[PDB]
């Protein structure tokens, strides 16, 4: 199903698309920004030299060099911001690869929506794509429970699990799969009286 889901719409890869878009759009502005006159008489260097005396051609050029150099500076600063953002995404991606892929992580909502089982990384242009495999509880049946149980005038507890009953008599089962078992001393440890 994942094959169809990714290719069904182009909005699935939205996170990767703007990384190559903002970069390819900032360059267009930088190329376009040299067309600005920046308050000078013209916007091409050769005409300034060919039509103005060198005593005052520098003044016209001054508004052009400082204008273009400053415009180039704001592009570099606009890159350091992105470099500090991708770095905050590569490290998160590196943590995903370290934990979700190379092992299993019990952290909730970190390697998928639900219980996490495994993962498979997939290569992507200018990025990475993960395939989280999740364990999701299906349709459920509700039961009547009881925190403890008293048999010989003495409290009894589930060693690991919960106490449930379908209406007649009680059963012990795991937390995430209804697998009832007969109450037995092996699954139970005593702790004090039941009063």
């Amino acid at each position: 199903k994942i094959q169809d889901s990714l290719s069904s719409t182009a909005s699935a890869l939205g996170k990767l698309q703007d990384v190559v878009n903002h970069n390819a759009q900032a360059l267009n502005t930088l190329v376009k920004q040299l067309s600005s006159k920046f308050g000078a008489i013209s916007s091409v260097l050769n005409d300034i030299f060919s039509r103005l005396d060198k005593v005052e051609a520098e003044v016209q050029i001054d508004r052009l060099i400082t204008g273009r150099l400053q415009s180039l500076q704001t592009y570099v600063t606009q890159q350091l911001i992105r470099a500090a953002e991708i770095r905050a995404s590569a490290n998160l991606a590196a943590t995903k690869m370290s934990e979700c892929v190379l092992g299993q992580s019990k952290r909730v909502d970190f390697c998928g929506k639900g219980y996490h089982l495994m993962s498979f990384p997939q290569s992507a242009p200018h990025g990475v794509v993960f395939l989280h495999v999740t364990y999701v509880p299906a349709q459920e049946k509700n039961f009547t429970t009881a925190p403890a149980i008293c048999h010989d005038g003495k409290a009894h507890f589930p060693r690991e699990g919960v106490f449930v009953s379908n209406g007649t008599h009680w059963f012990v089962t795991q937390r995430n799969f209804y697998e009832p078992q007969i109450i037995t001393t092996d699954n139970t440890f005593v702790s004090g009286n039941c009063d």
Partner: protein, 183 residues
């Protein structure tokens, strides 16, 4: 052009008090806001004309062509007053006396009919409003829907346990690097 103090705006009655000496009032932004008329000692109240950002609510260009417009930070009864030839920079003054208008915290949007049922957000607006292209077909702005409610039959002797399980593969996408560039 009070005594050479050039400016533009609309002047109303000002309840602020000027001492007989004081002439010009200034705000935190360090600009004039109240002037004393030479002929009438009554104090005016300078404030800029009606203005604000113009937001266009558009669906896909191929899908349709109607484009509702949202006006930012203005009383919805003021833009009808603004309608006048050579008085509004936009020449598309038709929407000001346009379709049914709905007023929100982000101004009033015009060209979209407010429907009071609930839908999931498609185009964000602000203050819990989301316009979308639905059913003939027009632009409707609704209230934010947070998902269908789901009561829990909690009881102090009841527990629910899943009798079955499913495995679903979830995807996740993260950028790792941009294009290296040099200048």
């Amino acid at each position: 052009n009070f005594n050479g103090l050039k400016g533009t705006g609309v002047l109303t009655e000002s309840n602020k008090k000027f001492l007989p000496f004081q002439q010009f009032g200034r705000d935190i932004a360090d600009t004039t806001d109240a002037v004393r008329d030479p002929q009438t000692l009554e104090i005016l109240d300078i404030t800029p004309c009606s203005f604000g950002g113009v937001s266009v609510i558009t669906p896909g260009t191929n899908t349709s062509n109607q484009v509702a417009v949202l006006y930012q930070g203005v009383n919805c009864t003021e833009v009808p007053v603004a309608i006048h030839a050579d008085q509004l920079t936009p020449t598309w003054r038709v929407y000001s006396t346009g379709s049914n208008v709905f007023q929100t915290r982000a101004g009033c949007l015009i060209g979209a009919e407010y429907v009071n049922n609930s839908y999931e957000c498609d185009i964000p607006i602000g203050a819990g409003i989301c316009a979308s292209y639905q059913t003939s077909q027009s632009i409707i702005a609704y209230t934010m829907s947070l998902g269908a409610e789901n009561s829990v039959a909690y009881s102090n002797n009841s527990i629910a346990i899943p009798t079955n399980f499913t495995i679903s593969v979830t995807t996740e996408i993260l950028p790792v690097s941009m294009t290296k560039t040099s200048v």
